[PDB]
Amino acid sequence: PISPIETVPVKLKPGMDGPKVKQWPLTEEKIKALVEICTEMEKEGKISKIGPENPYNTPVFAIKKSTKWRKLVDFRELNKRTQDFWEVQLGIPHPAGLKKKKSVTVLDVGDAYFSVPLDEDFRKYTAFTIPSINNETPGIRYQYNVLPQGWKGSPAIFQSSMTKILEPFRKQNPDIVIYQYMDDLYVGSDLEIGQHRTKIEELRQHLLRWGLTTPDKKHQKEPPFLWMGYELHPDKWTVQPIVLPEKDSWTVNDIQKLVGKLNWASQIYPGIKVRQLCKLLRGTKALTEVIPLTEEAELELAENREILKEPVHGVYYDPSKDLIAEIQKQGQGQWTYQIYQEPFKNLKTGKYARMRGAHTNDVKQLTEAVQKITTESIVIWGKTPKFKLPIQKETWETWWTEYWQATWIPEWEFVNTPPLVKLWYQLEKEPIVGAETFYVDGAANRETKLGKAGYVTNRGRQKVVTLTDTTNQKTELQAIYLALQDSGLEVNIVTDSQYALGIIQAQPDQSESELVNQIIEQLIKKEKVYLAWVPAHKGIGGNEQVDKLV
Amino acid sequence: ETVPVKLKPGMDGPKVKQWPLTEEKIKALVEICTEMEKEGKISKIGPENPYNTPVFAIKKSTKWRKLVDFRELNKRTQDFWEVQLGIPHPAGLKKKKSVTVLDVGDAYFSVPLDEDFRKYTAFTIPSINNETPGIRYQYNVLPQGWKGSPAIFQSSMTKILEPFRKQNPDIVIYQYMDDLYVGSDLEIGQHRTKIEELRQHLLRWGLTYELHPDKWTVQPIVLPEKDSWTVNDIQKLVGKLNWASQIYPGIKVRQLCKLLRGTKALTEVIPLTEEAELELAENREILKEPVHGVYYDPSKDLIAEIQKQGQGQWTYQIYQEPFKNLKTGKYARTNDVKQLTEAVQKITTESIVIWGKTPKFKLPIQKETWETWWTEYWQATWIPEWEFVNTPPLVKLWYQL
Ligand SMILES: Cc1cc(/C=C/C#N)cc(C)c1N1CC(=O)Nc2cnc(Nc3ccc(C#N)cc3)nc21
Numbered sequence: 001p002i003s004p005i006e007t008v009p010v011k012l013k014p015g016m017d018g019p020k021v022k023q024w025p026l027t028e029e030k031i032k033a034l035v036e037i038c039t040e041m042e043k044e045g046k047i048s049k050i051g052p053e054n055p056y057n058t059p060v061f062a063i064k065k066s067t068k069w070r071k072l073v074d075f076r077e078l079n080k081r082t083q084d085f086w087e088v089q090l091g092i093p094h095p096a097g098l099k100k101k102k103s104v105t106v107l108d109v110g111d112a113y114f115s116v117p118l119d120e121d122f123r124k125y126t127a128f129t130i131p132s133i134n135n136e137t138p139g140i141r142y143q144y145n146v147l148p149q150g151w152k153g154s155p156a157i158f159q160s161s162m163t164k165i166l167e168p169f170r171k172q173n174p175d176i177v178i179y180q181y182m183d184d185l186y187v188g189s190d191l192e193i194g195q196h197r198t199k200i201e202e203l204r205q206h207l208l209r210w211g212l213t214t215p216d217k218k219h220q221k222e223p224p225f226l227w228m229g230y231e232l233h234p235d236k237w238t239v240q241p242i243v244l245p246e247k248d249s250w251t252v253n254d255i256q257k258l259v260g261k262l263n264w265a266s267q268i269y270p271g272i273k274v275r276q277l278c279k280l281l282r283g284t285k286a287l288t289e290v291i292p293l294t295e296e297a298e299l300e301l302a303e304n305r306e307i308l309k310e311p312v313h314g315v316y317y318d319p320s321k322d323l324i325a326e327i328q329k330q331g332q333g334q335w336t337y338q339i340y341q342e343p344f345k346n347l348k349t350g351k352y353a354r355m356r357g358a359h360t361n362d363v364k365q366l367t368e369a370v371q372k373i374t375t376e377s378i379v380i381w382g383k384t385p386k387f388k389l390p391i392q393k394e395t396w397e398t399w400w401t402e403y404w405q406a407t408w409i410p411e412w413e414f415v416n417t418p419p420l421v422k423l424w425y426q427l428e429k430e431p432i433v434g435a436e437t438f439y440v441d442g443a444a445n446r447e448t449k450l451g452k453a454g455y456v457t458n459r460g461r462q463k464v465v466t467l468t469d470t471t472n473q474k475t476e477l478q479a480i481y482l483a484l485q486d487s488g489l490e491v492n493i494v495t496d497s498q499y500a501l502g503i504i505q506a507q508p509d510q511s512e513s514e515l516v517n518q519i520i521e522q523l524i525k526k527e528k529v530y531l532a533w534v535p536a537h538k539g540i541g542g543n544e545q546v547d548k549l550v
Numbered sequence: 551e552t553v554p555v556k557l558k559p560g561m562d563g564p565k566v567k568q569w570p571l572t573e574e575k576i577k578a579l580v581e582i583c584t585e586m587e588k589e590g591k592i593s594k595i596g597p598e599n600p601y602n603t604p605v606f607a608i609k610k611s612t613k614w615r616k617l618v619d620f621r622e623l624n625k626r627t628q629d630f631w632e633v634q635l636g637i638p639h640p641a642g643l644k645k646k647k648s649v650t651v652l653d654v655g656d657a658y659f660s661v662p663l664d665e666d667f668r669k670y671t672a673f674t675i676p677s678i679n680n681e682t683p684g685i686r687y688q689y690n691v692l693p694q695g696w697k698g699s700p701a702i703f704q705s706s707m708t709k710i711l712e713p714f715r716k717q718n719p720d721i722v723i724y725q726y727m728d729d730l731y732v733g734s735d736l737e738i739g740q741h742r743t744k745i746e747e748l749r750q751h752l753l754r755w756g757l758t759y760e761l762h763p764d765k766w767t768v769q770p771i772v773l774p775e776k777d778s779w780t781v782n783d784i785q786k787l788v789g790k791l792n793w794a795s796q797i798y799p800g801i802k803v804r805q806l807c808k809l810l811r812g813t814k815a816l817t818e819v820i821p822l823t824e825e826a827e828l829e830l831a832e833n834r835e836i837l838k839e840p841v842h843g844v845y846y847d848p849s850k851d852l853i854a855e856i857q858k859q860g861q862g863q864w865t866y867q868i869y870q871e872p873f874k875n876l877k878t879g880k881y882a883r884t885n886d887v888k889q890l891t892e893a894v895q896k897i898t899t900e901s902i903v904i905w906g907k908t909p910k911f912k913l914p915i916q917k918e919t920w921e922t923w924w925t926e927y928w929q930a931t932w933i934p935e936w937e938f939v940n941t942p943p944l945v946k947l948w949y950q951l
Pocket residue numbers: 093097098099100101104106177178179186187188223224225226227232233234235316681682
């Protein structure tokens with residue numbers, strides 16, 4: 001049937017006319033197949049022959065799907081000339097946001113697109129031509145009256161058509177849930193299996209009255225449903241079975257597919273790690289090339305196989321209870337988390353491992369992870385969780401009151417699950433009396449890429465090392481590193497590098513720079529470090545005379 | 551009869567993603583928009599409308615209010631509301647003793663919107679966990695938040711205020727988006743009385759907060775006065791002066807520099823030569839005075855930079871060319887994001903009053919933090935443009951008091 005639903009008006013893009021692609025001549029067998037396929041569609045109202053007036057055309061082909069034939073219309077040029085539509089849906093419901101359901105059935109709309117009418121004023125643009133044998137005769141010329149398969153507006157117009165049809169039934173049955181995905185309807189309720197398969201029949205009847213056929217009770221599926229990679233049960237959910245291939249040799253392509261399934265398992269299996277497996281994909285190799293697994297990559301693979309040994313399931317969402325989110329750091333900038341309402345029945349898990357910056361510390365990373373769990377919460381549940389974080393209330397305040405960027409993480413509580421988050425050093429707020437003062441300076445010749453780094457102190461020491469393949473930024477950090485090697489456990493350091501001051505004041509505990517990591521190692525051993533910035537080239541004390549040397 | 555609106559030539563409509571909303575704000579929006587729809591102000595739309603602008607709910611008063619982010623649509627119709635039907639900005643407003651801000655956005659819900667323009671005002675109420683398709687609407691009336699609305703309603707607004715202007719020629723009334731700014735030099739009781747009169751004029755047409763711009767003085771760069779002076783105190787002084795050199799023509803620092811000559815310990819006390827303390831004095835003079843030669847250019851955009859100082863204190867500068875500061879300030883006095891959100895609204899308001907423009911903000915915050923949270927403290931009906939920056943480490947030090 002074609003349903004009696006009002007049509008959605010459709011326009012070509014402005015300044016453009018409908019397509020006029022020419023029909024390639026087809027084989028006598030495809031022409032015969034197309035004529036059969038077209039006669040039956042024309043009978044049911046899906047298509048209509050048109051006179052020669054219509055000046056538009058789209059190529060049509062036919063391919064052997066067995067012994068049966070499929071009609072393939074190639075809407076590539078009409079699609080390019082059709083207006084844009086609002087898009088079909090902006091996200092997929094995550095299982096962890098679904099509520100518990102006593103009875104669930106999946107309905108499948110038959111011949112979805114061909115059961116919805118096409119805007120009468122737009123049909124002309126869908127004209128196609130079945131060519132004559134060795135292309136002698138004028139062909140037979142049709143146009144669509146329903147949504148064509150493969151045209152740009154089909155998915156959008158179908159799913160809004162389906163939405164206006166369901167909206168009555170939804171109002172008169174507020175506690176029945178129905179999710180539209182392409183030509184599936186997923187239907188859920190808390191009714192008993194008797195009263196539930198009643199209202200499904202009342203729904204099917206309401207769909208038939210709108211020209212939409214469905215399967216009989218014989219074809220409605222039963223839990224556990226496989227869906228979007230998940231395995232939904234009435235009271236729980238998991239990811240569909242994740243199998244880890246035991247191979248002697250791993251290709252790039254094998255490792256990419258393994259990282260994908262581990263990433264996907266990380267939604268409900270806590271503690272999955274992929275860092276060491278992803279390090280192997282760094283670089284440029286063909287998909288077919290074999291990658292030997294490093295020692296750390298094999299230890300990560302082993303620990304993952306351990307996590308996945310027996311199945312884990314998630315529970316669904318009770319709207320009447322708070323969400324708790326816990327974060328643990330796994331090391332190396334890897335974070336993992338669990339969201340539950342009753343400890344410890346997880347609605348879901350995840351991981352965070354972003355290099356946000358070249359240099360950061362665990363406190364900045366923990367905040368970043370809280371921010372991404374918070375956004376995710378809003379999406380899935382419409383509500384932020386209460387956090388349990390492995391950082392002391394006083395470490396956090398100390399950091400965020402001193403730091404120059406603003407922050408605001410929601411209600412949280414400390415939880416003693418080591419490794420705890422700490423700052424590993426802190427710069428003095430005022431110069432250290434009785435400590436040597438180093439006036440450091442770096443310089444690099446942009447032509448040469450050569451550089452000198454050095455210091456001079458108030459005690460009369462002095463030193464200048466030379467550097468190759470370097471930059472002003474690198475020499476200025478080399479200078480600070482020099483002063484920290486040669487200094488004792490207290491030291492004042494005067495630099496004209498706002499670059500270096502910027503980095504070091506943010507208390508990084510990890511960096512992509514081998515240098516910055518060596519400077520950090522040095523800053524932790526010290527007991528006291530004051531670091532000040534003085535304008536370069538203003539003849540300022542020791543700065544002009546360490547500027548000489550470099 | 552609707553005023554026809556065009557976008558800029560060769561520009562399409564806004565296609566801006568909807569930020570996720572909490573359950574409480576989605577429910578507030580759904581109530582508001584069923585009542586707007588039944589009153590005819592908006593209509594459901596179908597998939598053939600590909601446009602979108604974001605919506606939020608603000609509770610700015612105990613009642614939820616819908617806030618539509620038309621920043622993108624405003625950029626795309628900027629010839630209409632600025633060069634074709636612009637509202638002139640009075641230079642007298644910033645001189646008045648008292649300025650009262652009144653919301654007159656309900657005025658626009660009586661005027662119809664050009665039906666060939668309505669599709670560009672599309673918006674989406676999202677749903678939690680994407681379990682239902684978004685509810686989609688477009689406007690049939692002039693919407694709040696679009697700069698096209700005050701430009702179209704201009705004529706009407708001048709008929710409404712014409713009796714009140716004639717009877718009070720020394721009161722300045724300036725419209726900016728959904729607000730009237732009303733300035734007088736009256737004593738505050740008489741000022742409030744004249745505001746009450748004006749509300750009565752507006753109530754006969756369906757349109758049912760006190761600044762003192764006269765007292766918005768500069769936040770000068772301030773130099774310390776000290777008992778002693780270590781070398782570290784002098785180095786920080788030279789750095790702070792040398793950077794101030796780049797805005798204030800006249801700053802001198804080569805008499806303070808001589809004192810720092812060798813390689814001395816940071817904590818060593820250095821007596822100020824009689825030479826030097828004239829130059830602190832002279833630069834002190836300089837820094838308590840506006841910039842010579844910095845003038846507002848009406849064709850260029852306004853920029854606002856904000857630095858977090860700690861202890862609930864924040865500094866800001868407004869400029870069009872970096873270091874040519876048109877205005878500097880502080881904002882004082884909980885929560886970093888609540889405070890910053892308040893500072894952004896204060897700076898925007900002053901900026902509307904002074905130039906009739908809102909600035910683009912350089913915000914010292916992570917984007918996702920800001921976008922999660924700004925909604926819960928935002929009380930204005932407009933939204934300035936912003937981007938996210940990392941505050942240079944010492945710019946914060948040089949604007950401290
Ligand atoms: C998104 C979805 C997918 C399927 C997929 C089936 C396939 N393949 C079935 C339903 C009913 C929904 N929907 C629609 C909606 O709009 N809201 C829902 C709220 N809560 C649940 N919970 C829930 C609990 C257990 C089971 C099982 N077993 C299924 C769903 N489902 C909802």
